[PDB]
Design a binder for this molecule. Structure first.
Ligand SMILES: NC(=O)c1ccc[n+]([C@@H]2O[C@H](COP(=O)([O-])OP(=O)(O)OC[C@H]3O[C@@H](n4cnc5c(N)ncnc54)[C@H](O)[C@@H]3O)[C@@H](O)[C@H]2O)c1
Ligand SMILES: NC(=O)c1ccc[n+]([C@@H]2O[C@H](COP(=O)([O-])OP(=O)(O)OC[C@H]3O[C@@H](n4cnc5c(N)ncnc54)[C@H](O)[C@@H]3O)[C@@H](O)[C@H]2O)c1
Ligand SMILES: [Ca+2]
Lengths: 272, 278
């Protein structure tokens, strides 16, 4: 598996990703780029000192990276403002990359990767196990129209503005014959209620994504319940490591397909 | 509803009765004759507004002759016992009688083979609760599309049925089969079988009125570090899900017979793909 450069290793997700890469046995490139107004520094990720460099030095830094690590894959967890420029930079430099950063102009991001033939994974949702759940519910919904018609749907949700994941699952559930408007989602905002009702540990009130879907027969006798509860950043960190392993293999195979998403990574199976 | 009349064997069985009640309540024509098992006497029972002459299984030949003459388009619904599966199926297939069989057990491969080779219009499924079938399929879909997606996670499976059902549920086994393809490491004997009434009430939330007829299932999928938690429950009280799914299956198969379909043997997946007919 290929060595990885994580920009930015000092950001919260980027740090978690670099940690998880090191703990999994990937080689972490000991260089990183940080954002405007952040200065250069040395940081420790596991047993590796990383020379964190200001983004204005990116041309030089990438040349230092490429000479010592030809087969590097870049992992990008920066900010929406950097997304398009970073992508154009990675594509202009021939660098394969895994883009976790959300926002920016998404059509422009995809088209620059596709038109340049740059090996890449672009996925604004890297929590792969949740992605799998969401996608399978949809395929099932399309296979069995009206299978749950007459049932009652209740959807209750905790995050920190309804979750795109919850809306996607609700859309599938309508194809199953459930009637449920988007406004009927109960957002739990009160931390007391986030702890008590949903079981979120005190630790993760500022960093969680808990969802419950209850589907009940009109006579009360049939009860379905689906939960996916995410605490913190580990699912995204682990998802990113899996994406790097997938992309590395596809570069190694000289694959004709260049731009992948998390669905592609899931379909490639487990690699650890 | 230009749907076929139905003969429910055995309408004195717990599931057969529930099926026959639901068929009558849905507006199907219940054939006023039924077959009951060895040891049971002949009797008459009331199902909705219908008096059913219930006859001993040794009377099968003449009873089915009487039914065929009075109700030529009859579909037989079979909820009997495992010891009767193969004999009953081979009987229906010899008579050209279309059938819906929910009875579990027997030689399943032999059951499907005789249906297919005889060309008998049939629906054979050990789980007629179509909504539960849809959940099972969702898990299998996830495992086919995304193999190993939960590799490294821990699986806990806990299951509660009435005390007499002293063996793990077929639905739980099929779900676990999919979960293994998803990367979970889990032997079949690791399923926790809750069978003590006190535990069923307190731990599983089974209402007291449903202790002798329920099917509660919980699957927990947890990441190594404990930060990601999936939980799937499907909890059935009583038998109305099975009776309702059986009615749907009868209406489905009824249409296929009228339409004269080349395909003869169906399951509940096929019924789910046909859409809701009510
Ligand atoms: N794909 C996913 O599943 C997923 C999961 C969680 C978060 N995110 C997203 O990832 C992004 C990062 O989140 P976070 O909490 O780590 O943010 P953060 O603010 O903690 O870290 C972002 C870092 O990027 C740096 N940065 C800014 N511009 C840069 C540039 N041009 N080059 C290099 N570094 C630059 C900043 O200095 C900062 O250290 C956000 O857009 C967030 O929404 C995505
Ligand atoms: N597919 C499903 O959805 C589903 C759901 C629940 C139960 N079941 C199955 O249905 C079957 C019956 O369950 P139950 O609780 O109604 O059992 P039950 O014992 O209450 O009823 C079964 C009846 O079948 C009769 N019988 C036995 N042999 C017969 C024969 N050769 N001909 C006619 N009648 C005969 C018995 O006398 C008995 O009255 C079981 O195998 C059970 O596992 C299936
Ligand atoms: Ca810093």
């Amino acid at each position: 598996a290929a060595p990885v450069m994580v920009n930015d290793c000092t950001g919260k997700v980027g740090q978690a990703v670099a940690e998880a890469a090191v703990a999994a046995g990937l080689r972490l490139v000991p260089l990183s780029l940080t954002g405007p107004g952040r200065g250069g520094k040395r940081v420790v990720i596991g047993n590796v000192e990383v020379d964190v460099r200001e983004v204005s030095e990116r041309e030089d830094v990438v040349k230092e990276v490429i000479t010592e690590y030809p087969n590097v894959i870049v992992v990008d967890y920066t900010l929406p403002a950097a997304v398009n420029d970073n992508a154009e930079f990675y594509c202009k430099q021939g660098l394969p990359f895994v883009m976790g950063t959300t926002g920016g102009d998404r059509e422009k991001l995809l088209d620059v990767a596709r038109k340049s033939g740059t090996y890449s994974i672009i996925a604004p949702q890297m929590g792969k196990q949740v992605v799998a759940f969401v996608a399978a519910m949809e395929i099932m919904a399309k296979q069995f129209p009206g299978a749950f018609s007459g049932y009652t749907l209740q959807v209750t949700e905790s995050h920190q503005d309804v979750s795109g994941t919850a809306l996607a699952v609700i859309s599938s559930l309508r194809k199953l014959g459930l009637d449920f408007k988007d406004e009927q989602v109960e957002l739990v905002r009160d931390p007391k209620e986030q702890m008590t009702r949903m079981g979120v540990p005190e630790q993760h009130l500022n960093g969680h994504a808990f969802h419950t879907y209850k589907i009940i027969s009109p006579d009360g006798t049939v009860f379905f319940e689906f939960k996916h509860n995410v605490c913190g950043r580990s699912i995204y960190a682990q998802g990113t490591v899996d994406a790097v392993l997938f992309l590395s293999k596809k570069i190694q195979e000289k694959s004709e397909k260049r731009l992948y998403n998390m669905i592609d990574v899931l379909e490639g199976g487990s690699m650890r």
